[PDB]
């Protein structure tokens, strides 16, 4: 039974099951705001991911989804460092991740992208970090002459150097979280039936 090949093939399969189960759990804790459960599941997800020796496209997407949720959960923590470049704030790191998944769902993707960009600037402005807002803006909106949705609105706001703006009340941190929770509901609909959870659910049903 201990044929190395067959064992290697089986362990890849089992690790995929564990990864999916842990992503499911991370998503639910995220949605529910179960902060301690989220931390535990995160530690487990991280270890399981570090243990992988191979990646299907589905596994890579699942890793991205876990990374995305951990950046978003830390979005107001301007001192948390998720990239080698210590300048990159957590919501900027979330944006970079988002730029690798769900592109084919273009309307929801654009909506979430825009809200993250808005709040990447808002969290700096509301902290009184006006210079950092300017630097974030430059990194996420590219060439100053390039045009992008909400860019000119955000430049006006940054230039006024006030910790409060009405625009950030409408496109708020809570509104961003709600759109992201909608995306999380979608991941849940797709993954709530994966092997490990479905098997566990019938044991306790």
């Amino acid at each position: 039974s201990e044929d190395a090949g067959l064992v290697a093939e089986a362990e890849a399969v089992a690790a995929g099951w564990m990864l999916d189960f842990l992503c499911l759990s991370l998503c639910r804790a995220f949605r529910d705001g179960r902060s301690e459960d989220f931390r535990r599941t995160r530690n487990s997800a991280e270890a399981i991911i570090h243990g992988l020796s191979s990646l299907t496209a589905c596994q890579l997407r699942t890793i991205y989804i876990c990374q995305f949720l951990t950046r978003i959960a830390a979005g107001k923590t301007l001192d948390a460092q998720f990239e080698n470049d210590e300048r990159i704030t957590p919501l900027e790191s979330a944006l970079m991740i988002w730029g690798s998944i769900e592109k084919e769902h273009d309307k929801l993707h654009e909506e979430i992208q825009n809200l993250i960009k808005i709040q990447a600037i808002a969290v700096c402005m509301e902290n009184g970090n006006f210079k950092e807002a300017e630097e974030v803006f430059e990194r996420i909106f590219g060439d100053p002459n390039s045009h992008m949705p909400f860019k000119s609105k955000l430049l006006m706001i940054i230039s006024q150097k006030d910790t409060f703006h009405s625009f950030f009340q409408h496109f708020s941190y809570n509104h961003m979280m709600e759109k992201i929770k909608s995306y999380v509901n979608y991941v849940l609909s797709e993954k709530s039936s994966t092997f490990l959870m479905k098997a566990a659910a019938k044991v306790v049903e």
């Binding site: 995160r42 991280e46 570090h50 830390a74 923590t77 001192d79 460092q81 998720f82």
Partner: peptide, 12 residues
């Protein structure tokens, strides 16, 4: 590479 858990900008 930073995976799921972050470092602290306010250190060293």
């Amino acid at each position: 590479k930073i995976l799921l858990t972050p470092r602290r900008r306010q250190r060293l």
